[PDB]
Coordinates of N, CA and C in Angstrom, one line a residue:
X1 N -17.3 5.5 -6.6 CA -15.9 6.2 -6.5 C -16.0 7.7 -6.8
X2 N -15.2 8.5 -6.1 CA -15.2 9.9 -6.3 C -14.7 10.3 -7.7
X3 N -15.1 11.5 -8.2 CA -14.5 12.0 -9.4 C -13.0 12.1 -9.2
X4 N -12.5 12.6 -8.1 CA -11.1 12.8 -8.0 C -10.4 11.5 -8.1
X5 N -10.9 10.5 -7.4 CA -10.2 9.2 -7.4 C -10.1 8.7 -8.9
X6 N -11.2 8.9 -9.6 CA -11.3 8.4 -11.0 C -10.3 9.2 -11.8
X7 N -10.2 10.5 -11.5 CA -9.4 11.4 -12.3 C -8.0 11.1 -12.1
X8 N -7.6 10.9 -10.8 CA -6.2 10.5 -10.5 C -5.9 9.2 -11.2
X9 N -6.8 8.2 -11.2 CA -6.5 7.0 -11.8 C -6.3 7.1 -13.3
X10 N -7.1 8.0 -13.9 CA -7.0 8.3 -15.3 C -5.7 8.9 -15.6
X11 N -5.2 9.8 -14.8 CA -3.9 10.4 -15.1 C -2.8 9.4 -14.9
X12 N -2.9 8.5 -13.9 CA -1.9 7.5 -13.7 C -1.8 6.5 -14.9
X13 N -3.0 6.2 -15.4 CA -3.0 5.3 -16.6 C -2.4 6.0 -17.8
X14 N -2.7 7.2 -18.0 CA -2.3 8.0 -19.2 C -0.8 8.0 -19.2
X15 N -0.2 8.2 -18.1 CA 1.2 8.5 -18.0 C 2.0 7.4 -17.4
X16 N 1.4 6.3 -17.1 CA 2.1 5.1 -16.6 C 2.8 5.6 -15.3
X17 N 2.1 6.2 -14.4 CA 2.7 6.6 -13.1 C 2.0 5.8 -12.0
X18 N 2.8 5.4 -11.1 CA 2.3 4.8 -9.8 C 2.2 5.9 -8.8
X19 N 1.5 5.6 -7.7 CA 1.4 6.5 -6.6 C 2.7 6.9 -6.1
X20 N 3.7 6.0 -6.0 CA 5.0 6.4 -5.5 C 5.6 7.5 -6.4
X21 N 5.4 7.4 -7.7 CA 5.9 8.3 -8.6 C 5.3 9.7 -8.5
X22 N 3.9 9.7 -8.3 CA 3.2 10.9 -8.1 C 3.7 11.6 -6.8
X23 N 3.8 10.8 -5.8 CA 4.2 11.4 -4.5 C 5.6 12.1 -4.7
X24 N 6.5 11.3 -5.3 CA 7.9 11.9 -5.6 C 7.8 13.2 -6.4
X25 N 7.0 13.2 -7.5 CA 6.9 14.4 -8.3 C 6.3 15.5 -7.5
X26 N 5.5 15.2 -6.5 CA 4.8 16.3 -5.7 C 5.8 17.0 -4.8
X27 N 6.9 16.3 -4.5 CA 7.7 16.8 -3.4 C 8.2 18.2 -3.6
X28 N 8.7 18.5 -4.8 CA 9.1 19.9 -5.0 C 8.0 20.9 -4.9
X29 N 6.8 20.6 -5.3 CA 5.6 21.4 -5.1 C 5.2 21.5 -3.7
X30 N 5.3 20.4 -2.9 CA 5.0 20.5 -1.5 C 5.9 21.6 -0.9
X31 N 7.1 21.6 -1.2 CA 8.1 22.5 -0.7 C 7.8 23.9 -1.2
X32 N 7.5 24.0 -2.5 CA 7.2 25.3 -3.2 C 6.0 26.0 -2.5
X33 N 5.0 25.3 -2.3 CA 3.7 25.9 -1.8 C 3.5 25.8 -0.3
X34 N 4.3 25.0 0.3 CA 4.1 24.7 1.7 C 2.8 23.9 1.9
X35 N 2.5 22.9 1.0 CA 1.4 22.1 1.2 C 1.9 20.6 1.3
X36 N 1.5 20.0 2.5 CA 2.0 18.7 2.7 C 1.1 17.6 2.1
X37 N 1.7 16.5 1.7 CA 0.9 15.4 1.2 C 1.6 14.1 1.6
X38 N 1.0 13.3 2.4 CA 1.5 12.0 2.8 C 1.2 10.9 1.9
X39 N 2.0 9.8 1.9 CA 1.7 8.6 1.3 C 0.3 8.1 1.6
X40 N -0.1 8.1 2.9 CA -1.4 7.5 3.2 C -2.5 8.4 2.8
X41 N -2.3 9.7 2.7 CA -3.3 10.6 2.3 C -3.5 10.4 0.8
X42 N -2.5 10.4 0.0 CA -2.6 10.2 -1.4 C -3.2 8.8 -1.7
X43 N -2.9 7.8 -0.9 CA -3.5 6.5 -1.1 C -5.0 6.5 -0.8
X44 N -5.4 7.3 0.2 CA -6.8 7.5 0.5 C -7.5 8.2 -0.6
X45 N -6.9 9.2 -1.2 CA -7.5 9.9 -2.3 C -7.7 8.9 -3.5
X46 N -6.7 8.2 -3.9 CA -6.8 7.3 -5.0 C -7.8 6.2 -4.7
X47 N -7.9 5.8 -3.5 CA -8.8 4.7 -3.1 C -10.2 5.2 -2.9
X48 N -10.5 6.5 -3.0 CA -11.8 7.1 -2.9 C -12.3 7.1 -1.5
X49 N -11.4 7.1 -0.5 CA -11.7 7.1 0.9 C -11.9 8.6 1.3
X50 N -11.0 9.4 0.9 CA -11.0 10.9 1.2 C -11.0 11.7 0.0
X51 N -11.5 12.9 0.1 CA -11.5 13.8 -1.0 C -10.5 14.9 -0.7
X52 N -9.7 15.3 -1.7 CA -8.7 16.3 -1.4 C -9.4 17.7 -1.1
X53 N -8.8 18.4 -0.2 CA -9.2 19.8 0.1 C -8.6 20.7 -1.0
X54 N -8.9 22.0 -0.9 CA -8.5 22.9 -1.9 C -7.0 22.9 -2.1
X55 N -6.2 22.9 -1.0 CA -4.8 22.9 -1.1 C -4.2 21.7 -1.8
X56 N -4.8 20.5 -1.5 CA -4.2 19.3 -2.1 C -4.6 19.2 -3.5
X57 N -5.8 19.7 -3.9 CA -6.2 19.7 -5.3 C -5.2 20.5 -6.1
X58 N -4.9 21.7 -5.5 CA -3.9 22.6 -6.2 C -2.6 21.9 -6.3
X59 N -2.1 21.3 -5.2 CA -0.8 20.6 -5.2 C -0.8 19.5 -6.3
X60 N -1.8 18.7 -6.4 CA -1.8 17.6 -7.3 C -2.0 18.1 -8.7
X61 N -2.7 19.2 -8.9 CA -2.8 19.7 -10.3 C -1.5 20.3 -10.8
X62 N -0.8 21.0 -9.9 CA 0.5 21.4 -10.3 C 1.5 20.3 -10.5
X63 N 1.5 19.3 -9.7 CA 2.4 18.1 -9.8 C 2.2 17.4 -11.1
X64 N 0.9 17.2 -11.4 CA 0.6 16.4 -12.6 C 0.4 17.3 -13.9
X65 N 0.5 18.6 -13.7 CA 0.4 19.5 -14.9 C -1.0 19.4 -15.5
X66 N -2.0 19.4 -14.7 CA -3.4 19.3 -15.2 C -4.2 20.5 -14.5
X67 N -5.3 20.8 -15.1 CA -6.2 21.8 -14.6 C -6.7 21.5 -13.2
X68 N -6.7 22.4 -12.3 CA -7.3 22.3 -11.0 C -8.7 22.0 -11.1
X69 N -9.4 22.7 -12.0 CA -10.9 22.6 -12.2 C -11.2 21.2 -12.6
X70 N -10.5 20.6 -13.5 CA -10.7 19.3 -14.0 C -10.5 18.3 -12.8
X71 N -9.4 18.5 -12.1 CA -9.1 17.5 -11.0 C -10.2 17.4 -9.9
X72 N -10.8 18.6 -9.7 CA -11.9 18.7 -8.7 C -13.1 17.8 -9.0
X73 N -13.3 17.7 -10.3 CA -14.5 16.9 -10.8 C -15.7 17.8 -10.6

């Protein structure tokens, strides 16, 4: 499993957030930064299928209020 997948799952556990909740929290940041994130893409990240690019790492770090550096693994 990728660092990022693990790190996302860690955050989910710490905060009792499901993917649907993360995606919803990301929406204002998607709009703020002009960075899109789909349900399937987020699912693929959590599943360790895909690794986020620079923009989505940034988006997710702002959404979750965590360090970009940490989320990158």
